[PDB]
PDB file of C-alpha atoms and ligand atoms in Angstrom:
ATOM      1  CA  UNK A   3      32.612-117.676-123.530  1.00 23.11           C
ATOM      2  CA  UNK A   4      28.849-117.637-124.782  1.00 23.74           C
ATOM      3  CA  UNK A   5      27.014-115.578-126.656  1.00 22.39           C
ATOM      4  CA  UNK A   6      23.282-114.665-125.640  1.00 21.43           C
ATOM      5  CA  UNK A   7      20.567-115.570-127.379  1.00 23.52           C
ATOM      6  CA  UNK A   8      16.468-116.150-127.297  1.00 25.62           C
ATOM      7  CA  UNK A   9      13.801-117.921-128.866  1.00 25.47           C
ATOM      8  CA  UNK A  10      10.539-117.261-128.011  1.00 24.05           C
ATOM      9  CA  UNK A  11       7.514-120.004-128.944  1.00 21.00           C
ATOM     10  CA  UNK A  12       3.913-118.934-128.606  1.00 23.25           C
ATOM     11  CA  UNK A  13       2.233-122.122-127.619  1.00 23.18           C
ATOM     12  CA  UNK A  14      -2.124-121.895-127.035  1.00 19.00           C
ATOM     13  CA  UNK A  15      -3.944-125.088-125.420  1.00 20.05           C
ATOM     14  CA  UNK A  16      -4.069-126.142-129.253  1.00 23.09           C
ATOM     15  CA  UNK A  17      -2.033-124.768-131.099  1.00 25.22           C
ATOM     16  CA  UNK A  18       1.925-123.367-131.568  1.00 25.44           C
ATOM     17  CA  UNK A  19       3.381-120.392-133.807  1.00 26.72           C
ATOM     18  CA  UNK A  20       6.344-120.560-136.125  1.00 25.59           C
ATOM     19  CA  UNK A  21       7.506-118.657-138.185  1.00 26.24           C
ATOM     20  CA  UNK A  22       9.559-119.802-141.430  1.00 26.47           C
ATOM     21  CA  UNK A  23      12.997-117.849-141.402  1.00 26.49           C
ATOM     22  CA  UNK A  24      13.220-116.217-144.730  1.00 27.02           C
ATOM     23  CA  UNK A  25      17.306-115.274-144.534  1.00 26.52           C
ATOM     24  CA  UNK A  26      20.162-115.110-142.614  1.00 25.36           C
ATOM     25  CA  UNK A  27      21.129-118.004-139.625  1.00 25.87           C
ATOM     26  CA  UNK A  28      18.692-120.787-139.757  1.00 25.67           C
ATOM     27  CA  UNK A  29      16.661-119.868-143.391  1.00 26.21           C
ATOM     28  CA  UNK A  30      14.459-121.948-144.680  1.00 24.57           C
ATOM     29  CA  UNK A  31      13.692-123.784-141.240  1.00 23.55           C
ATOM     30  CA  UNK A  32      10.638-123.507-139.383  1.00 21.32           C
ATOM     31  CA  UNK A  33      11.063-122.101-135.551  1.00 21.86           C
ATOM     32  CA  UNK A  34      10.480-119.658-133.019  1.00 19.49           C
ATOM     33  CA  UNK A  35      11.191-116.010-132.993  1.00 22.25           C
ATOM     34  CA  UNK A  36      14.428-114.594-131.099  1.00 23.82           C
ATOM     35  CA  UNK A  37      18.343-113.525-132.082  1.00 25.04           C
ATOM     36  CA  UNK A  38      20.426-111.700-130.380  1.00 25.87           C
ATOM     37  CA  UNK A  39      20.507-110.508-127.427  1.00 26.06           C
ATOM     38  CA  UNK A  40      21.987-106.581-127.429  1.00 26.27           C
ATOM     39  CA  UNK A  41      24.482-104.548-125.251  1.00 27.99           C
ATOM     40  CA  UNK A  42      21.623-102.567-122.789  1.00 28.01           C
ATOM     41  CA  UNK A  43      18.961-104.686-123.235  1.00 29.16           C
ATOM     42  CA  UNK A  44      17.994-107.681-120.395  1.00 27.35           C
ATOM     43  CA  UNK A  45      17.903-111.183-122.378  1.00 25.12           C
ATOM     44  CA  UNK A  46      13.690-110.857-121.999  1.00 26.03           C
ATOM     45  CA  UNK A  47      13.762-107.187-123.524  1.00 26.56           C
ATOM     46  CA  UNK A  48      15.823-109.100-126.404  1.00 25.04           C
ATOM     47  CA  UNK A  49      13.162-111.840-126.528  1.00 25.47           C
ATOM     48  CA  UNK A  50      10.315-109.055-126.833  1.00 26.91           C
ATOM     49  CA  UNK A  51      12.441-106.960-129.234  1.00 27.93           C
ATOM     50  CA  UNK A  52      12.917-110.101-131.708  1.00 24.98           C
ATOM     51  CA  UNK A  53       9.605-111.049-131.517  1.00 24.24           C
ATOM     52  CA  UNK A  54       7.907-107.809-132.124  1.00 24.88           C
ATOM     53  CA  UNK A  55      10.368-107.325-134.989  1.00 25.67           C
ATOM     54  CA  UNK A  56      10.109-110.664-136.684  1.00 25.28           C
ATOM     55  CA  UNK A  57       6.082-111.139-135.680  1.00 27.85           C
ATOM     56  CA  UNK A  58       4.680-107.315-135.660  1.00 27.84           C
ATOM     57  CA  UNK A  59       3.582-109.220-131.677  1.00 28.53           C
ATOM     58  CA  UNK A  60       3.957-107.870-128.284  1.00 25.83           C
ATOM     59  CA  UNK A  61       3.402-109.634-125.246  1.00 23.95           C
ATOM     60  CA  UNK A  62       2.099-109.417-121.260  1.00 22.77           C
ATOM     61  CA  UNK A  63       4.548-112.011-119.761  1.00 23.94           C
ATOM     62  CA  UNK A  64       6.912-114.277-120.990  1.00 24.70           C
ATOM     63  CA  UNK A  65       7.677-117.094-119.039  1.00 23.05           C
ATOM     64  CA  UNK A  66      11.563-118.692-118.792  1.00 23.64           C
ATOM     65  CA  UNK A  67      10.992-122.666-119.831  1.00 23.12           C
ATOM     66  CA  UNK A  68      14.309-123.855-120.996  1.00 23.84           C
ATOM     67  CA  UNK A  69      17.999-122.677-121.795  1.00 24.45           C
ATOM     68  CA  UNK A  70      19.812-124.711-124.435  1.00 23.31           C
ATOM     69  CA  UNK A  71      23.587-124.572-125.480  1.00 25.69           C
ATOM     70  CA  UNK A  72      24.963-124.904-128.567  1.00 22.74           C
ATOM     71  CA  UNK A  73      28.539-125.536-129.680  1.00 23.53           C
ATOM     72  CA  UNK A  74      29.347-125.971-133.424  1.00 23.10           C
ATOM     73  CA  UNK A  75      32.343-127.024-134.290  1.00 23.25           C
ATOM     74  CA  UNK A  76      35.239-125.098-135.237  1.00 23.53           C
ATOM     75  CA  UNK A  77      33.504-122.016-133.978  1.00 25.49           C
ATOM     76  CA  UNK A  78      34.242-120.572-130.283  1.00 21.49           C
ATOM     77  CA  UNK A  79      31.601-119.096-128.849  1.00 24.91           C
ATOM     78  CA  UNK A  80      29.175-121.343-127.547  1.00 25.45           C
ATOM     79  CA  UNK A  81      25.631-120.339-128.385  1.00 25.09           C
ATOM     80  CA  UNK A  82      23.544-120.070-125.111  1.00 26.92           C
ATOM     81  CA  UNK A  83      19.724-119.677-126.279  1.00 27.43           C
ATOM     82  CA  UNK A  84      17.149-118.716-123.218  1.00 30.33           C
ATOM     83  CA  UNK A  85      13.793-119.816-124.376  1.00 31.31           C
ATOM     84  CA  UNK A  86      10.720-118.109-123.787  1.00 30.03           C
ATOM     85  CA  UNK A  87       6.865-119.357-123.791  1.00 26.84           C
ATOM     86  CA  UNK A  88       3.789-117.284-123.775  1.00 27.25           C
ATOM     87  CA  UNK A  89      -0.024-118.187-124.112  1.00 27.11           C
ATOM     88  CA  UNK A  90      -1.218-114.500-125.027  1.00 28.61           C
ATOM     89  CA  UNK A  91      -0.047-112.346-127.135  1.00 28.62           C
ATOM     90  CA  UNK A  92      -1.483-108.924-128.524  1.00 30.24           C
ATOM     91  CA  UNK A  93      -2.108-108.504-132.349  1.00 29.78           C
ATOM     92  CA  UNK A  94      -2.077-110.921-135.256  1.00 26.15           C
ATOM     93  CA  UNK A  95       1.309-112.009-136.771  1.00 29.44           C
ATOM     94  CA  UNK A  96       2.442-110.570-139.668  1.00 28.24           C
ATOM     95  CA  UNK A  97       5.085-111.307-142.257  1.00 24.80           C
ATOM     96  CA  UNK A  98       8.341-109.615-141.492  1.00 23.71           C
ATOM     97  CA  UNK A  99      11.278-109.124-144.033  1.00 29.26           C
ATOM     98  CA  UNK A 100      12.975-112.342-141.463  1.00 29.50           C
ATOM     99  CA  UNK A 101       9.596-114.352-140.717  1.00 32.38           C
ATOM    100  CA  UNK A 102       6.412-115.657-142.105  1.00 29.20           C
ATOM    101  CA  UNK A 103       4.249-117.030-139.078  1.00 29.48           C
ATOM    102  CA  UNK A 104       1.927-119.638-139.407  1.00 30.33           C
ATOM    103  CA  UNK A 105      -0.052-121.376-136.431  1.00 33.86           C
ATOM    104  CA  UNK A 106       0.375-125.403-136.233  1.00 30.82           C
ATOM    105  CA  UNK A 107      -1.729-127.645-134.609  1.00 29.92           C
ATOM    106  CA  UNK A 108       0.309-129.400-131.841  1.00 27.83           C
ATOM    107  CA  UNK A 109      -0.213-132.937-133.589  1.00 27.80           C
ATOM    108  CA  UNK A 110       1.588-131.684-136.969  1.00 28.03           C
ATOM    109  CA  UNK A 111       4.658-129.924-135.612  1.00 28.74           C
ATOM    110  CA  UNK A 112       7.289-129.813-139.143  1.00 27.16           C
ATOM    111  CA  UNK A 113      10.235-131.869-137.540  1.00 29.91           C
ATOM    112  CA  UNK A 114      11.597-132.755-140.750  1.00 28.82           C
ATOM    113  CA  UNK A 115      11.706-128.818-141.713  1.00 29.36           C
ATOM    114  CA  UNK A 116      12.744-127.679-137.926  1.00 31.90           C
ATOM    115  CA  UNK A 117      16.607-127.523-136.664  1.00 33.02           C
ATOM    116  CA  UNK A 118      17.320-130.792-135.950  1.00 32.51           C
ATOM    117  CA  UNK A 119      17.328-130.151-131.657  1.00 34.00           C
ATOM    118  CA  UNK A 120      13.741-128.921-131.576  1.00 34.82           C
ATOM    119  CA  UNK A 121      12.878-132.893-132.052  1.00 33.96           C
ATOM    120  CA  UNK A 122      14.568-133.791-128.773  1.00 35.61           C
ATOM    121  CA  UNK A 123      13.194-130.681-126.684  1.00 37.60           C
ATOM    122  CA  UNK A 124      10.041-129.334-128.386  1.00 37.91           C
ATOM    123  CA  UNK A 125       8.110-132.220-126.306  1.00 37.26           C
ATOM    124  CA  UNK A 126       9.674-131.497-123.108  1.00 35.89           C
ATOM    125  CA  UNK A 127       8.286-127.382-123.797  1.00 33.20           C
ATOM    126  CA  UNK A 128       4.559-129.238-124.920  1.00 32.43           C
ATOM    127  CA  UNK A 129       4.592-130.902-121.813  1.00 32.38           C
ATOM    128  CA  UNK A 130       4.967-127.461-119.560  1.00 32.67           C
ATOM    129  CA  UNK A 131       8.073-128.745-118.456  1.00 32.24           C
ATOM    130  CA  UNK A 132      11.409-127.099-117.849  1.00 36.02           C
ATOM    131  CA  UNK A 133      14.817-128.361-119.369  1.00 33.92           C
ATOM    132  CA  UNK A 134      19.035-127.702-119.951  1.00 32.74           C
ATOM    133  CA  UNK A 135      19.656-128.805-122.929  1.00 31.96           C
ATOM    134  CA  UNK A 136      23.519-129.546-124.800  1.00 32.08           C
ATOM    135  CA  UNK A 137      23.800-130.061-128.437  1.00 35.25           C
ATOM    136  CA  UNK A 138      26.627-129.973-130.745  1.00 33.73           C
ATOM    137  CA  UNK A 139      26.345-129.707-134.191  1.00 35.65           C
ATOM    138  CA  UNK A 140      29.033-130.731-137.131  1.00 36.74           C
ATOM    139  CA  UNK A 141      28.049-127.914-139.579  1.00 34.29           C
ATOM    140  CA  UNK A 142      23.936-126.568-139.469  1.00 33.66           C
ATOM    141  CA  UNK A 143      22.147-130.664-140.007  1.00 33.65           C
ATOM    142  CA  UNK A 144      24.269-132.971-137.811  1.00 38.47           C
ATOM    143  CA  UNK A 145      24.274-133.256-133.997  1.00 37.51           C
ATOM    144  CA  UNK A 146      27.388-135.312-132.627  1.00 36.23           C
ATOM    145  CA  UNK A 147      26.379-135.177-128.866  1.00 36.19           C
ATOM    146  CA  UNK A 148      23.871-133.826-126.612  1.00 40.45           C
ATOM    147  CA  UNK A 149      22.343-133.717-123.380  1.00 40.80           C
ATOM    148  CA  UNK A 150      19.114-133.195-122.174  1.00 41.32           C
ATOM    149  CA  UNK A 151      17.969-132.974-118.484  1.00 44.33           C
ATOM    150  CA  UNK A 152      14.381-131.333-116.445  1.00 43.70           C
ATOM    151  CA  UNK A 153      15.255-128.643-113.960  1.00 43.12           C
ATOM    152  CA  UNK A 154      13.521-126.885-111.858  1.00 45.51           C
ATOM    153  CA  UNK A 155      15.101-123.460-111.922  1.00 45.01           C
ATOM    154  CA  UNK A 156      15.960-122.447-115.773  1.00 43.51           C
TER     155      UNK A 156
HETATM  156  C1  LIG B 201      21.116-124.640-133.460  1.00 43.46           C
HETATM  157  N1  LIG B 201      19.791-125.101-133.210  1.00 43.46           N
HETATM  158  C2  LIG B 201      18.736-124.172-132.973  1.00 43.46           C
HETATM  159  C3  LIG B 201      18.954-122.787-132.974  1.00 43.46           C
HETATM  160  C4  LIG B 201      17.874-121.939-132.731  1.00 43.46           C
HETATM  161  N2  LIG B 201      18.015-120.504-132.682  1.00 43.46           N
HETATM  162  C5  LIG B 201      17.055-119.783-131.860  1.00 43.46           C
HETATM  163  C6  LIG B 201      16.961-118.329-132.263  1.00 43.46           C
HETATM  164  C7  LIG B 201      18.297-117.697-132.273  1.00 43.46           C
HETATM  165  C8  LIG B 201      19.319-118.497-132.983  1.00 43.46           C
HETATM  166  C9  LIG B 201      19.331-119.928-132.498  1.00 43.46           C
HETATM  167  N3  LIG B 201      16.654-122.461-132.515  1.00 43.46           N
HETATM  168  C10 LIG B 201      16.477-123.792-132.520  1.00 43.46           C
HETATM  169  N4  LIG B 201      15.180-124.306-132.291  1.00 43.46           N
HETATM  170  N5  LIG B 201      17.505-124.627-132.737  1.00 43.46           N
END
């Protein structure tokens, strides 16, 4: 059994959003916008719901570019993330009481200050290519295994 989840990255010709989780899972890490998915929503409504909630942004289309799966140990539901990429958006970001956005230029990407995955397959989404990804993680800094693999249907 998984649980759904998305993350949603907002990635111009030059330049990617992040937003710098303020509390709950993940705090104090720069990443994309997304959390649960609900009961009656579709995974993308759950995408557009987190990131208009966390961002103040809506969005025309949002594109499927990867699906990654995480397993931490000791806990039994598998997390099973859909990610989501857009070049437009509508608005400006906006703080949130769960995000403060910030645009990076895609030569200074904060790694060191990202979950420790994004380093792996945060190049594969630069490169406008789709991927599966495995990770499992020994508490929220240490991955144990992983795999990583292009597909052509996420
Ligand atoms: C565990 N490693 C993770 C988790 C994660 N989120 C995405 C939003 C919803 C929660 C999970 N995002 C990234 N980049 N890495």
């Amino acid at each position: 059994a998984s649980r759904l989840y998305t993350l949603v990255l907002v990635l111009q010709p030059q330049r990617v959003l992040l937003g710098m989780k303020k509390r709950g899972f993940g705090a104090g890490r720069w990443n994309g916008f997304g959390g649960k998915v609900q009961e009656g929503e579709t995974i993308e409504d759950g995408a557009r719901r987190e990131l208009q909630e966390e961002s103040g942004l809506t969005v025309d289309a949002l594109h499927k570019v990867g699906q990654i799966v995480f397993e931490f140990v000791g806990e039994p539901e598998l997390m099973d993330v859909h990610v989501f990429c857009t070049d437009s958006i509508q608005g400006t970001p906006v703080e949130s009481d769960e995000m403060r956005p910030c645009w990076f230029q895609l030569d200074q990407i904060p790694f060191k200050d990202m979950w420790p995955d994004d380093s792996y397959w945060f190049p594969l989404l630069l490169q406008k290519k789709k991927f599966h990804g495995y990770f499992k993680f020994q508490g929220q800094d240490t991955i144990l295994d992983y795999t990583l693999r292009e597909v052509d249907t996420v």
